[PDB]
Amino acid sequence: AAYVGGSDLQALKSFIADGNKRLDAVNSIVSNASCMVSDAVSGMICENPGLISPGGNCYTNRRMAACLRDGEIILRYVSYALLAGDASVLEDRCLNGLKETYIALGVPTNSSIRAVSIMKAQAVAFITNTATERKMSFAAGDCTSLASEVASYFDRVGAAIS
Amino acid sequence: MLDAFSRVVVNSDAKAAYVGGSDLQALKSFIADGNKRLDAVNSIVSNASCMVSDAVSGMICENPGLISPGGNCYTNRRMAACLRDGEIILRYVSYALLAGDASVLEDRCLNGLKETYIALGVPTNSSIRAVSIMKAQAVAFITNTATERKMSFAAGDCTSLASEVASYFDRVGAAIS
Amino acid sequence: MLDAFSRVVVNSDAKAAYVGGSDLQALKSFIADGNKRLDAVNSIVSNASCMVSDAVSGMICENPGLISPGGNCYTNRRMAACLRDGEIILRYVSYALLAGDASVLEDRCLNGLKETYIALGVPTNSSIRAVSIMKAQAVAFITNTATERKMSFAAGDCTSLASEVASYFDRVGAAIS
Amino acid sequence: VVLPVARAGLAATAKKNQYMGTSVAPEIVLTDKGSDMSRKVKTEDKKVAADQAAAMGILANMSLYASLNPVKRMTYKAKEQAPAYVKKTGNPVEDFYPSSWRNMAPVISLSANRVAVAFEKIDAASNGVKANSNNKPFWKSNYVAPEAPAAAYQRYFPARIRNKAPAMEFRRPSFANTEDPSAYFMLQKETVPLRMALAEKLLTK
Ligand SMILES: *C(=C)C1=C(C)[C@@H](Cc2[nH]c(/C=C3N=C(/C=C4\NC(=O)[C@H](C)[C@H]4[C@@H](*)C)C(C)=C\3CCC(=O)O)c(CCC(=O)O)c2C)NC1=O
Ligand SMILES: *C(=C)C1=C(C)[C@@H](Cc2[nH]c(/C=C3N=C(/C=C4\NC(=O)[C@H](C)[C@H]4[C@@H](*)C)C(C)=C\3CCC(=O)O)c(CCC(=O)O)c2C)NC1=O
Ligand SMILES: *C(=C)C1=C(C)[C@@H](Cc2[nH]c(/C=C3N=C(/C=C4\NC(=O)[C@H](C)[C@H]4[C@@H](*)C)C(C)=C\3CCC(=O)O)c(CCC(=O)O)c2C)NC1=O
Ligand SMILES: *[C@@H](C)[C@H]1/C(=C/C2=NC(=C\c3[nH]c(C[C@H]4NC(=O)C(C=C)=C4C)c(C)c3CCC(=O)O)/C(CCC(=O)O)=C2C)NC(=O)[C@@H]1C
Ligand SMILES: *[C@@H](C)[C@H]1/C(=C/C2=NC(=C\c3[nH]c(C[C@H]4NC(=O)C(C=C)=C4C)c(C)c3CCC(=O)O)/C(CCC(=O)O)=C2C)NC(=O)[C@@H]1C
Ligand SMILES: *[C@@H](C)[C@H]1/C(=C/C2=NC(=C\c3[nH]c(C[C@H]4NC(=O)C(C=C)=C4C)c(C)c3CCC(=O)O)/C(CCC(=O)O)=C2C)NC(=O)[C@@H]1C
Ligand SMILES: *[C@H](C)[C@H]1/C(=C/C2=NC(=C\c3[nH]c(C[C@H]4NC(=O)C(C=C)=C4C)c(C)c3CCC(=O)O)/C(CCC(=O)O)=C2C)NC(=O)[C@@H]1C
Ligand SMILES: *[C@H](C)[C@H]1/C(=C/C2=NC(=C\c3[nH]c(C[C@H]4NC(=O)C(C=C)=C4C)c(C)c3CCC(=O)O)/C(CCC(=O)O)=C2C)NC(=O)[C@@H]1C
Ligand SMILES: *[C@H](C)[C@H]1/C(=C/C2=NC(=C\c3[nH]c(C[C@H]4NC(=O)C(C=C)=C4C)c(C)c3CCC(=O)O)/C(CCC(=O)O)=C2C)NC(=O)[C@@H]1C
């Protein structure tokens, strides 16, 4: 574990002018991360109700608790990727070996992509403060560059499972 | 066959669930007469106590022999079982109206109900008369022609749901026949 | 013991007596000339159906006008009542033989009988002939001189018991005289 | 001259991601109270847990949505699941209404923006005796009755006395001059029957 604050935090903010903007975009995802994963996986089942049918992959409480875990593990790496600005840790630790794992278990990759697609939609609403149900208080300005970057990190997830 | 909900409730996983909030509003998009169908269920469920009490008492009026000495609604438990079954029968029809499917009504409730009733010596002809009285109050409530209690509704036509409920009760009559 | 036997036949709330082993040996000590008396009453009860049918069939053979219209054995109801009375009288005479006294027969059977037969129009002279046949039958069975049945006994004389039973039958004809 | 299991392990280890079977994900928490001395960012690897309790809420609520939706009912025709083996007993009361399912019925509750369904055991009663009082728990819990059997003259013979007579039966000891515990006598009373079939057969002859 590491901590950065005070005078040392201002040093890391000096390396990139959007240091406050980048940190304000991680605080809109980790504050809503519980609502995001719960809505993504639920929205995956509204679209494809065969997942909670007999023979489904989200039938039984043990499997869906693992499905809910996976969207959280995925989202935590993408949130770390935004804070760090690089996809290196996301690719090396989370996405390397995921698809070979999923085919053996029988996890459907196409519906798994739908959940990641919803979280990417939920992410850019929170970063750009355009959510219809909830708002956050921000200094006035434009974060369109950062919200584009988060979309790119979700597509590395989708590419790795395709 | 069951549906998605009753399959989890027979597994003893969860006994209750709710659809609400935004997810309810998405459910409205995939149904025609969505406000209408939830309104017709409300008219049955909010009168569930009065409907059953009217039905079995009407069965007593139509034939007094059920509370005869040597009858079958003699002793306090058999009468209480009569009120219980009429309540149980009614609530499945209210769920069948909600999902628009007789399957859970047929597989869970109606399956084998007749041979049970023959084993208990239940008069099946009079059980018909209870569930056919319960039909009459349902169609009266939905079309809002009910004399004693009037509901407040946005205007429209509800013949379709009125004809739908009469089919469901008639199916119960067929299995119990 | 024998007084309690008389209460068992007279009372309406008397536990049906069963007697065996040491209580049957006690009874054998209490009855006067016990084994011959028990063998005398056994010979009656073992033939009682043939006795009553033959006695009524005898009184009818000798006066067939009893079966003509206006005859007091005409119609099935009358014939049945006559057959029934023949068995009742035989049964009370068999208890008088068991007891060695007429009191149960007099008190329970013969008191009031004359007046009922007079009131009903039952002919007492032909009744006395039915009784006289069952007298002859009873004397024959007790002395083992019946024509078409023999019973098995230890050798001896039972003429005292036959003479006693004759006195009980002769009492029925003197009461309805 | 080849060890295949050793080659399989070494080839697998040289490519396997160490993190893939551990569910460890980076946690981020940021503190900000509007002063430059308060702002602090920390990161820490932490294993993500499976909350089986909250998974029930999603599974229950969506399956109700999946059943009330009528167009997903045809574009997604779900599969029949065969029920588990439970032995049958021939009585339809226990075959068709076993105690695990018996008396359950769906309560429906409709509110502003909420539709809720709950399966509940429906009890009702008369006086203070309930319908399911027949099946009370064990912690809330005799002699046998015998089988029942199938007048101007009245001054002389009352109705309680008419046609009533003694009845008697015997069994002498089986062997001459010898004791026998199987020997008996019985003394009783009974009303003589009408004998009407024998009286008809005798009247015909
Ligand atoms: C099935 C019935 C089904 C779903 C359930 C649900 C899935 C879904 N959700 C969106 C859009 C969004 N959901 C968001 C999450 C939340 N909003 C909040 O206020 C709280 C904090 C949080 C948890 C509930 C967000 C932020 C969005 C973004 C846009 C918006 O505000 O609507 C979608 C649409 C995805 C897209 O935009 O393409 C879906 C599919 N919807 C269902 O129908
Ligand atoms: C014996 C005396 C006997 C009665 C018991 C009674 C039985 C009976 N009931 C109906 C019809 C209806 N009962 C209804 C129930 C009620 N109306 C309300 O407002 C409350 C909430 C509720 C409880 C009292 C309803 C709605 C009806 C339909 C009538 C209508 O159009 O409103 C019937 C007639 C049904 C039929 O056989 O066709 C009977 C026989 N009547 C008795 O004689
Ligand atoms: C008309 C055709 C007519 C008669 C009917 C019949 C009536 C009658 N009966 C007796 C005498 C006896 N009847 C007896 C009965 C039986 N004997 C048996 O062996 C069987 C088991 C049993 C049932 C049929 C007996 C035992 C006697 C006594 C015989 C004896 O004399 O010792 C009589 C004659 C005596 C009398 O006059 O009272 C009569 C007339 N007889 C008919 O003629
Ligand atoms: C895009 C996400 C938003 C938006 C974001 C902006 N925030 C700006 C200034 C700002 N934000 C913070 C808080 C943030 N910095 C930290 O160090 C911490 C965490 C420890 C948090 C989470 C600060 C401190 C600041 C600086 C101003 C201040 O002192 O309050 C900002 C202005 C640009 C800039 O200052 O660099 C923007 C644009 N605003 C939006 O409208 C979109 C939706
Ligand atoms: C026949 C049964 C009735 C009839 C039914 C109608 N109801 C209409 C509108 C309406 N009803 C409700 C309440 C109901 N829908 C819900 O979602 C909820 C809560 C879950 C309940 C139980 C609502 C909210 C509405 C919509 C109100 C609006 O118009 O904005 C209606 C109009 C058309 C429609 O929307 O379906 C009809 C015809 N009305 C009658 O007169 C008969 C007797
Ligand atoms: C006139 C009745 C007979 C006759 C009868 C004799 N029987 C004699 C002995 C005897 N009889 C029985 C049966 C009787 N005793 C009972 O306990 C019961 C039923 C519970 C019955 C029906 C028994 C047991 C005995 C005792 C001898 C034995 O069988 O072991 C008997 C001899 C009496 C004596 O002197 O002790 C006689 C004379 N004999 C006749 O010749 C006429 C036709
Ligand atoms: C939900 C969004 C999906 C779904 C997911 C399931 N995943 C299951 C097991 C599983 N998942 C992973 C990958 C995951 N674990 C990690 O450590 C990493 C990151 C470093 C990732 C992101 C693994 C390795 C495993 C297996 C090990 C384990 O059980 O924890 C799973 C259960 C499979 C089973 O039935 O045995 C499910 C259901 N499945 C779906 O259909 C939706 C789309
Ligand atoms: C009143 C409308 C009727 C009638 C009712 C009676 N039912 C009796 C017992 C009984 N009922 C059922 C079926 C019921 N149980 C369920 O779980 C559900 C479905 C969800 C159904 C609809 C069963 C299986 C049984 C027997 C088991 C039990 O209740 O403990 C009953 C008592 C008779 C008895 O138990 O011997 C009555 C009186 N019968 C009538 O005559 C009127 C018309
Ligand atoms: C057969 C040899 C007769 C004959 C007999 C009939 N008796 C009729 C009625 C009757 N008999 C008695 C006496 C009887 N009942 C008792 O309870 C006792 C002793 C405890 C005895 C000895 C009574 C009291 C009655 C009237 C009540 C009843 O019927 O039970 C009878 C019916 C007459 C009629 O209804 O027409 C008949 C035929 N009848 C004959 O003619 C021959 C001689």
What CATH number does the domain containing B143 carry? 1.10.490.20
Could you tell me if D181 lies within 8 Å of chain C, comparing CB atoms? yes
Do A48 and D76 form a contact (C-beta atoms < 8 A)? yes
Q: In what order do the strands lie in the sheet with C17-20?
A: C17-20, D184-191, D164-171
Alpha carbon of B54: minimum distance to chain D alpha carbons (Å): 14
Residues of chain B contacting A43 with CB distance shorter than 8 Å: none
Handedness of CA D87, D93, D97, D98 (dihedral sign): negative
* Atom 26 (ligand 5) nearest CA: B35
Do A94 and A74 form a contact (C-beta atoms < 8 A)? yes
- Going from the Cα of B122 to the center of ligand 8, the distance in angstroms, rounded, reads 8
Could you tell me if D166 lies within 8 Å of chain C, comparing CB atoms? yes
Torsion of CA C80, C86, C91, C93, to 10 degrees: 170
| Binding site as annotated, residues of B for phycourobilin | 50, 61
Residues of chain A contacting D65 with CB distance shorter than 8 Å: 46
Residues β-bridged to residue D25: D46
A57 Cβ below 6 A of ligand 1:
no
Chains C and D physically touch (3 or more Cβ atom pairs below 8 Å): yes
The H-assigned helical ranges of C63-112 are 76-99, 103-105
- Going from the Cα of C130 to the center of ligand 3, the distance in angstroms, rounded, reads 11
The candidate with the shortest Cα–Cα distance to C102, out of C51, C171, C47, is C171
Residues β-bridged to residue D111: D114
Structural domain boundaries, residue C94? 1-177
Residues of chain A contacting D55 with CB distance shorter than 8 Å: 61, 64-65, 68
**SS3 annotation, chain D:** CCCHHHHHHHHHHCCCCCCCCCCEEEEEEEECCCCCCCCEEEEEEEECCCCHHHHHHHHHHHHHHHHHCCCHHHHCCCCCCCCCCCCCCCCHHHHHCCCCCCCEEEEEEEECCEEEEEEEECCCEECCEEHHHHHCCHHHCCCCCCCCCCCHHHHCCCCCCCCEEEEEEEECCCCCCCCCCCCEEEEEEEECCCCHHHHHHHHHC
Alpha carbon of D167: minimum distance to chain C alpha carbons (Å): 8
Q: DSSP letter for A131, please.
A: -
Q: How far apart are CA C32 and CA C38, in angstroms?
A: 10
The candidate with the shortest Cα–Cα distance to B125, out of B50, B62, B168, B78, is B62
Q: Is A132 left (phi over 0), alpha (psi -120 to 50) or beta?
A: alpha
Could you tell me if C69 lies within 8 Å of chain D, comparing CB atoms? no
The candidate with the shortest Cα–Cα distance to B138, out of B56, B43, B58, B49, is B43
Do B92 and B154 form a contact (C-beta atoms < 8 A)? no
Rounded to a whole number of angstroms, the CA Rg of chain C reads 17
Do D185 and C27 form a contact (C-beta atoms < 8 A)? yes
Compute CA D182 distance to the chain's CA centroid, rounded to the nearest angstrom.
Answer: 53
Could you tell me if B91 lies within 8 Å of chain D, comparing CB atoms? yes
Declared resolution, Å:
2.8
Who contacts A149 (Cβ-Cβ below 8 Å, separation ≥6)? Answer: A82, A85
* Atom 2 (ligand 5) nearest CA: B40
Among all bound ligands, the one having the nearest atom to the CA of B47 is 2
Q: How was this structure determined?
A: cryo-EM
Helix (H, G, I), strand (E, B), or coil: what is residue A2?
A: strand
Helix (H, G, I), strand (E, B), or coil: what is residue A4?
A: strand
- By Cβ distance, the residue of B9, B21, B84 closest to D119 is B9
| Contact between D81 and B101 using a beta-carbon 8 Å cutoff | no
Q: Which residue has the tokens 């010898």?
A: D178
Any chains having at least 3 CB pairs less than 8 A from chain A are: B, D
The candidate with the shortest Cα–Cα distance to C166, out of C142, C143, C135, C141, is C135
- By Cβ distance, the residue of D155, D160, D187 closest to C5 is D187
| Contact between D199 and C120 using a beta-carbon 8 Å cutoff | no
A94 is in an annotated binding site: no
Question: Which of the residues B1, B2, B3, B5 would you substitute to probe the D interface, choosing the one with the greatest number of D C-beta atoms within 10 Å?
Answer: B5
Who contacts B141 (Cβ-Cβ below 8 Å, separation ≥6)? Answer: B43, B44, B47, B149, B151
Could you tell me if A41 lies within 8 Å of chain D, comparing CB atoms? yes
The candidate with the shortest Cα–Cα distance to D188, out of D161, D171, D172, D168, is D168
Alpha carbon of B37: minimum distance to chain D alpha carbons (Å): 11
Residues β-bridged to residue B19: D115
**SS3 annotation, chain B:** CCCHHHHHHHCCCCCEEEEECHHHHHHHHCCCCHHHHHHHHHHHHCCHHHHHHHHHHHHHHHCHHHHCCCCCCCCHHHHHHHHHHHHHHHHHHHHHHHHCCCHHHHHHHHCCHHHHHHHHCCCHHHHHHHHHHHHHHHHHHHCCCCCCCCCCCCCCCCHHHHHHHHHHHHHHHHHHC
Q: How far apart are CA D195 and CA C80, in angstroms?
A: 6
C144 Cβ below 6 A of ligand 6:
yes
Compute CA B118 distance to the chain's CA centroid, rounded to the nearest angstrom.
Answer: 22
Q: How far apart are CA A7 and CA B121, in angstroms?
A: 88
Chains C and B physically touch (3 or more Cβ atom pairs below 8 Å): no
Do D179 and C67 form a contact (C-beta atoms < 8 A)? no
Total number of domains constituting chain B: 1
Chains C and A physically touch (3 or more Cβ atom pairs below 8 Å): no
Q: Which atom of ligand 4 is nearest to the CA of D31?
A: 20
Pairing of strands D24-31, D40-47: antiparallel
Do D189 and C8 form a contact (C-beta atoms < 8 A)? yes
- Going from the Cα of C96 to the center of ligand 1, the distance in angstroms, rounded, reads 108
Q: Which residue has the tokens 């006008």?
A: C65
From D91, D99, D100, D102, give the residue whose CB has the most ligand 8 atoms within 8 Å, as the site to mutate.
Answer: D102
Q: How far apart are CA C137 and CA C149, in angstroms?
A: 11
Who contacts C24 (Cβ-Cβ below 8 Å, separation ≥6)? Answer: D183, D184, D185
With both helix axes pointing from N to C terminus, report the angle between A19-26 and A61-84 in degrees, rounded to the nearest 10.
Answer: 170
Could you tell me if B98 lies within 8 Å of chain D, comparing CB atoms? yes
Do A44 and A118 form a contact (C-beta atoms < 8 A)? yes
Residues β-bridged to residue D30: D41
Identity (one letter) of the amino acid at C115? E
Q: How far apart are CA C95 and CA C102, in angstroms?
A: 9
